[PDB]
Write a protein that binds this ligand. Structure first.
Ligand SMILES: CCCCCCCCOCCOCCOCCOCCO
Ligand SMILES: CCCCCCCCOCCOCCOCCOCCO
Ligand SMILES: O=C(O)[C@H]1CSC(c2ccccc2O)=N1
Ligand SMILES: O=C(O)[C@H]1CSC(c2ccccc2O)=N1
Ligand SMILES: [Fe+3]
Ligand SMILES: [K+]
Length: 670
């Protein structure tokens, strides 16, 4: 079953399989890629509210830029940036909240590392580091009436309902509802947040037919918006990170961000060896904000805050259609897939940058003036239109009793966009391109519990427009094609698994040359090693650990100051260690501890501005019991227990850490 939910692995904190785009779901041991899938059980035990909450705490390959006090999270994977807008939904792009994906309705959060253009086509944001994928909850046969209430520092009060039922003869239909409302002061100075959310997972199970519909509504409202710190022209050293409770940006900033979507999916078995599938979905996303980015000035901690208003109205549709089947050519079995997809978007995005206000890193800002931004009032004009569409064919060849598996495929990807001036309405650019893109993989199973593998696959990004100072100001460059080679090994001991991987990812870079011409003449070469252990090695001791090493080389630049240096915002070393322990001496009590480490990194391409390594420690506890015949669970989570302040590096800017943060919750099943 291509859409069959993979089972939980030993310990119940990760799953045994995950999605590979058009190929559907595959088991960890049958996948020639590094995949990880985190369960709803992990989400609930740790009290994780967003994708960033989950991945930062547990995964050694993923690091978050922005954070929960900002309006947006992005993610760094295998030394490249991954946009939140590029998070997939059962494989499909364009259907989840654009700036920050909430996960209290999710059954799984999967990470596939490296590019995967053949498997799912281009990402809307052009990300090539990896693909994160959410799986929605579904109604189980046993009905579910689950209520919890929660408290988060300093005054956020929340409630979450999770209710499921099935109906029709043979439980043919299912309905799962999730409702959340969390409101109050956050852990940062003079900030509050309000968050309502609604989701419905509906499904039908038939003899030859399976259908589902997912509906989601979400809104995040902030009074006070944290923003990055940018370098300046004369920055010579990065100052020490301030107390993470300080809020050094615009005092009276706000955000209102709303997203809602619907997607229908289906499968119909035409015969014992043929199946047709299709999906169609749409998303609306509305954005309103005034806030400011902080620019370093001098080198003792003084800043200038650069103010802006922004408004956004984004309309997206997303579709796929295909067939899957299987036939035997002697001692060779063919498992094949023919697939086509299509994304189309209309965007209105307006903005005005007015205001430069004095500040300081180590002081929470006073009320300052908000400039007159009424020139953006009224209807939001169209500024971009995008169309992405593709066709792909893939075939998995199995032989020697499935112990050798060779996968081949190719995809034709079309790209098109138009842009219009936000004040004038004038047509500015119209890009149209196509690219053919393939994959090849081979997996061998010398033992029933040991797999070895190698892959080759590509990533694609739309070309950038030249800056309006360069000689080719308006011109959009040709697409950037990344190429991955990977080899690895996976060893399942039954109770726990060890994996090892080595990869290389090469991708072109664009820079303004000596003659002031914008060109994709640069190249990046990221080579890395990945190690991980997860499972339940002793009864009642659950462990998730891992470590990565990457050399992110700027191997081709126009500048002797940057040639062969490291790409900015990529630490060479990263590690994570999580433990969860059912105490043998108290019935129903579980203790958790996590340690996250990020090594030193640079902010500039010349590597003149370094930022230090950092560590975060989390502590947790859960006590399960019964009242009047009902199961209940009380939980605590202390994030950043040691109260450390640290910068996360990116390309030309830094984002501040979150303060020590305690959350408490009580769950009951009725
Ligand atoms: C609980 C009923 C499930 C609703 C399924 C709707 C499927 C519609 O799909 C049509 C496009 O494919
Ligand atoms: C007024 C809202 C109350 C919601 C918070 C529930 C408090 C549960 O905390 C118990 C903490 O102990 C955890 C033991 O493990
Ligand atoms: O450049 C970007 O990526 C966007 C993300 S939101 C953003 C922003 C938002 C509010 C105020 C100022 C900003 O630069 N910048
Ligand atoms: O968020 C940032 O870093 C700044 C860089 S320029 C910038 C911007 C420029 C044009 C339009 C929107 C923007 O956010 N945002
Ligand atoms: Fe910006
Ligand atoms: K545009």
């Amino acid at each position: 079953g291509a859409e069959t939910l993979p089972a939980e692995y030993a310990g119940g904190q990760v799953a045994r399989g995950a999605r590979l785009g058009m190929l559907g779901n595959a088991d960890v041991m049958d996948a020639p890629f590094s995949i990880t899938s985190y369960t709803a059980r992990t989400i609930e035990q740790q009290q994780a509210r967003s994708v960033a909450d989950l991945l930062q705490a547990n995964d050694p390959s993923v690091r978050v830029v922005g954070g929960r006090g900002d309006l947006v999270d992005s993610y760094t994977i295998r030394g490249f940036s991954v946009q939140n807008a590029d998070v997939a939904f059962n494989g499909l792009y364009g259907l989840l909240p654009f700036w920050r994906v909430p996960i209290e309705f999710a059954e799984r959060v999967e990470v596939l590392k490296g590019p995967n253009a053949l498997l799912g086509g281009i990402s809307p944001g052009g990300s090539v580091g990896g693909t994160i994928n959410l799986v929605p909850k579904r109604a189980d046969d046993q009905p579910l009436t689950r209520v919890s209430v929660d408290w988060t520092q300093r005054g956020q009060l929340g409630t979450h309902l999770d209710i499921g039922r099935r109906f029709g003869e043979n439980n043919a239909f299912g309905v799962r509802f999730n409702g959340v409302y969390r409101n109050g002061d956050t852990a940062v100075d003079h900030q509050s947040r309000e968050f309502p959310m609604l989701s419905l997972g509906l499904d039908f199970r038939g003899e030859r037919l399976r259908l589902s519909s997912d509906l989601l509504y979400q809104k995040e409202s902030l009074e006070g918006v944290v923003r990055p710190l940018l370098t300046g022209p004369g920055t010579t050293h990065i100052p020490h990170a301030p107390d993470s409770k300080t809020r050094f940006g615009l005092r009276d900033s706000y955000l209102d961000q709303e997203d809602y979507s619907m997607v229908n999916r289906g499968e119909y078995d035409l015969a014992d060896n043929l199946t047709a599938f299709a999906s169609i979905g749409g998303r609306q996303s509305n954005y309103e904000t005034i806030a400011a980015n902080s620019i370093l000035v001098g080198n003792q901690g003084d800043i200038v805050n650069s103010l802006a208003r922004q408004r956004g109205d984004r309309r997206t549709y997303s579709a796929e259609v295909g067939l899957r089947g299987n036939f035997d050519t002697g001692p060779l079995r063919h498992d094949w897939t023919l697939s086509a997809n299509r994304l189309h978007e209309r965007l209105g995005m307006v903005y005005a940058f007015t205001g430069m206000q004095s500040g300081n890193l180590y002081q929470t800002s006073p009320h300052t003036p908000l400039p007159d931004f009424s020139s953006l009032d009224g209807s939001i004009p169209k500024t971009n239109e995008t169309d992405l569409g593709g066709v792909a064919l893939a075939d998995r060849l199995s032989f020697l009793e499935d112990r050798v598996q060779v996968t081949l495929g190719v995809r034709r990807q079309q790209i098109e966009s138009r842009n219009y001036d936000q004040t004038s309405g004038a047509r500015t650019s119209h890009d149209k391109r196509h690219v053919w893109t393939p994959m090849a993989s081979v997996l061998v199973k010398p033992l029933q519990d040991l797999s070895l593998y190698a892959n080759y696959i590509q990533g694609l990004s739309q070309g950038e427009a030249a800056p309006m100072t360069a000689a080719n100001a308006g011109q959009v460059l040709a697409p950037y094609k990344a190429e991955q080679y990977e080899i690895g090994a996976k060893y399942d001991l039954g109770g726990f698994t060890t994996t090892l991987a080595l990869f290389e990812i090469r991708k072109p870079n664009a820079y303004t040359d000596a003659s002031n011409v914008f060109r994709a003449d640069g190249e990046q070469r990221n080579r890395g090693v990945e190690l991980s252990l997860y499972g339940e090695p002793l009864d009642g001791v659950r462990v998730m650990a891992g470590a990565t090493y990457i050399k992110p080389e700027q191997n081709k630049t126009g500048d002797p100051a940057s040639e062969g240096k490291d790409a900015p915002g990529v630490a060479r070393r990263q590690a994570n260690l999580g433990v969860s322990w059912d105490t043998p001496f108290v019935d129903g009590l579980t203790l958790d501890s996590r340690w996250i480490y990020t090594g030193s990194a640079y902010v500039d391409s010349a590597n003149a501005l370094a930022v230090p390594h950092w560590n975060r420690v989390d502590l947790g506890a859960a006590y399960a019991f019964q009242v009047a015949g009902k199961p209940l669970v009380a939980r605590a989570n202390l994030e950043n227990a040691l109260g450390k302040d640290y910068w996360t590096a990116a390309n030309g800017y830094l984002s501040i850490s979150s303060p020590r943060t305690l959350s408490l919750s009580l769950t009951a099943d009725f």
